[PDB]
Amino acid sequence: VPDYHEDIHTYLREMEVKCKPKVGYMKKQPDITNSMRAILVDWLVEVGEEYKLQNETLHLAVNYIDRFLSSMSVLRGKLQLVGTAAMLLASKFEEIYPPEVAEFVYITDDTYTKKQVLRMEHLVLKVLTFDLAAPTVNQFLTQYFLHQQPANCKVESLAMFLGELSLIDADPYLKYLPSVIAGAAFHLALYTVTGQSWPESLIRKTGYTLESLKPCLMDLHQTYLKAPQHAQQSIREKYKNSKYHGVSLLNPPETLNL
Amino acid sequence: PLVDMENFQKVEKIGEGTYGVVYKARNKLTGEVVALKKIRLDTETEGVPSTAIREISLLKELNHPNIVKLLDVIHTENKLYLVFEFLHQDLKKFMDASALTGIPLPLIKSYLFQLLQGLAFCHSHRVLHRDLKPQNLLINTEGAIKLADFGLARAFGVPVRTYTHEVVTLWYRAPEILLGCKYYSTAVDIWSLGCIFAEMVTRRALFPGDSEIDQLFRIFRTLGTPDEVVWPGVTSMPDYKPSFPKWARQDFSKVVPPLDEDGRSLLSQMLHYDPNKRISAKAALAHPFFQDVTKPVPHLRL
Numbered sequence: 001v002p003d004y005h006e007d008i009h010t011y012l013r014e015m016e017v018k019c020k021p022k023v024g025y026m027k028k029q030p031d032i033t034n035s036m037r038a039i040l041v042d043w044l045v046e047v048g049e050e051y052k053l054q055n056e057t058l059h060l061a062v063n064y065i066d067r068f069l070s071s072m073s074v075l076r077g078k079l080q081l082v083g084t085a086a087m088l089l090a091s092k093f094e095e096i097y098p099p100e101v102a103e104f105v106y107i108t109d110d111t112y113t114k115k116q117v118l119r120m121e122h123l124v125l126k127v128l129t130f131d132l133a134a135p136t137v138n139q140f141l142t143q144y145f146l147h148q149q150p151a152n153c154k155v156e157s158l159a160m161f162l163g164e165l166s167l168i169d170a171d172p173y174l175k176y177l178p179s180v181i182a183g184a185a186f187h188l189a190l191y192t193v194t195g196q197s198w199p200e201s202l203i204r205k206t207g208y209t210l211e212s213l214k215p216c217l218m219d220l221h222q223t224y225l226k227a228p229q230h231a232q233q234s235i236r237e238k239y240k241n242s243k244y245h246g247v248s249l250l251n252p253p254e255t256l257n258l
Numbered sequence: 259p260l261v262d263m264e265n266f267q268k269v270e271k272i273g274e275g276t277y278g279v280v281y282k283a284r285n286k287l288t289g290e291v292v293a294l295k296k297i298r299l300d301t302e303t304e305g306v307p308s309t310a311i312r313e314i315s316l317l318k319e320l321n322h323p324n325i326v327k328l329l330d331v332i333h334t335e336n337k338l339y340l341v342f343e344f345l346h347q348d349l350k351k352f353m354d355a356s357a358l359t360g361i362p363l364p365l366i367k368s369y370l371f372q373l374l375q376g377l378a379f380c381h382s383h384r385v386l387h388r389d390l391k392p393q394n395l396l397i398n399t400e401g402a403i404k405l406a407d408f409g410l411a412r413a414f415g416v417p418v419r420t421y422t423h424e425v426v427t428l429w430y431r432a433p434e435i436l437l438g439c440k441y442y443s444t445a446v447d448i449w450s451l452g453c454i455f456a457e458m459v460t461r462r463a464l465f466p467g468d469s470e471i472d473q474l475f476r477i478f479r480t481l482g483t484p485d486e487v488v489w490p491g492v493t494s495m496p497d498y499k500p501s502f503p504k505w506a507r508q509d510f511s512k513v514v515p516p517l518d519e520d521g522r523s524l525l526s527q528m529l530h531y532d533p534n535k536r537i538s539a540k541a542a543l544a545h546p547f548f549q550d551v552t553k554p555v556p557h558l559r560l
């Protein structure tokens with residue numbers, strides 16, 4: 001356990017409240033829908049797999065996209081340009097060496113130009129006012145894992161899996177803070193793999209009781225159950241790999257007995 | 259955008275660099291003196307550089323007296339300007355100018371104290387500096403010192419992976435990095451600080467390596483080649499070699515002669531081999547070495 005472990009969690013909790021996008025922004029977009037967003041994010045996951053990007057990169061990009069769309073009306077044919085720019089910026093921020101812009105233009109099947117991508121980068125930066133270091137579910141899970149005596153790789157992969165799935169559906173995850181989604185994912189994964197529950201140490205650390213996580217937990221469990229039937233499958237595929245101990249193949253418990 | 263740039267009068271060039279150029283400038287309307295870092299965006303047509311992305315996004319989150327203030331950001335069609343508060347000198351030039359007389363111990367103590375405060379703030383805000391060296395530390399006539407140059411900085415809400423290219427200049431590079439560890443930790447910034455502390459005190463770089471292997475040997479020759487007992491796991495690290503010479507640890511009173519018991523104690527804790535055991539900026543601030551810290555003003559030969 002680090003020396004600034006606590007100060008950092010406290011600060012992350014403070015910042016997550018600030019980089020929070022508008023929950024009801026999609027209803028106010030005249031041309032795009034949740035499904036279109038779902039399709040975009042699913043696509044970003046593939047891009048991330050194609051260029052072997054960190055998972056954190058994926059989460060930042062989604063955060064950039066949801067904040068951008070919370071104040072800028074975007075048309076169908078431009079949604080992907082916004083997401084491409086968001087992935088480019090996220091890569092620059094998180095990756096050791098991001099793919100060149102040309103690669104991002106390529107993965108769009110030349111739908112846009114190097115020029116359009118760089119201009120959208122500028123606009124996104126302006127709209128977000130260069131505040132790119134946002135807290136993600138990934139970051140909270142990381143902090144949470146240090147509070148796991150029985151360090152279990154299967155538990156971690158699965159929590160990561162459930163955290164990643166929440167990115168796909170604005171409804172109902174947009175209304176939950178990253179620390180809460182992480183909490184639910186952590187418990188659900190721990191429960192499914194070891195039968196253990198939200199640990200006392202994290203209750204003290206986060207102030208979240210199993211009770212407070214219930215609303216999100218019930219939703220995450222539902223997403224888990226329906227996971228195989230979902231229109232978007234890039235994440236399940238990704239988590240079949242041995243790198244993640246094939247946790248997307250694990251069967252979700254029937255009930256949570258909360 | 260270009261309206262703001264018109265309000266600045268260029269005074270003189272402060273420094274160069276890859277990212278671009280830094281000029282001392284003056285706000286024509288307010289009279290405020292600043293440092294303008296100009297970045298050309300047509301020298302790669304790769305968009306905004308990753309370094310700017312990070313320095314800007316991380317720096318605007320760090321507001322502390324011992325961290326350089328980013329006042330503004332102006333993004334034109336092909337140019338990116340970062341506006342910083344202005345400080346009279348950087349630690350490297352000052353150390354250079356203090357060669358004959360040396361920097362008074364009270365001022366050295368004051369500077370370390372302030373540097374640890376700035377660093378503690380960075381770390382408690384999940385930011386790793388990663389490039390602490392005399393050149394990146396700014397000082398003014400009042401006796402304050404501030405961390406600057408956050409181009410290589412990184413948020414570690416999620417572990418930061420090691421990169422061959424993006425690394426501290428050799429002389430201040432932590433041993434874990436030289437031995438090829440997987441992830442960075444706050445410990446690498448503390449190590450750099452210890453090296454600077456020693457350099458200020460003795461008037462000579464502590465570990466002036468010529469190469470990576472030579473850097474490691476310089477460190478081993480002074481602090482002793484580390485073993486499993488001193489640093490659990492060291493022999494298993496990627497670049498560790500069982501053929502490494504086995505040097506004995508040099509007596510600290512001979513490495514930094516002008517230092518007293520407290521100074522020697524603090525320095526050795528900052529240079530502890532095991533990164534998990536290396537003292538933190540926070541705990542260093544509580545060390546009895548700073549029992550009598552004050553805030554002297556330097557003799558700046560401007």
Ligand SMILES: O=C(Cc1ccc2ccccc2c1)Nc1cc(C2CC2)n[nH]1
Pocket residue numbers: 270271272273280282293295326342343344345346347348396406407
């Ligand atoms: O970097 C210096 C010291 C310096 C160095 C060289 C000079 C040459 C001429 C005039 C003033 C000069 C001042 N100061 C400074 C740099 C900055 C921001 C870029 C970080 N703010 N203040």
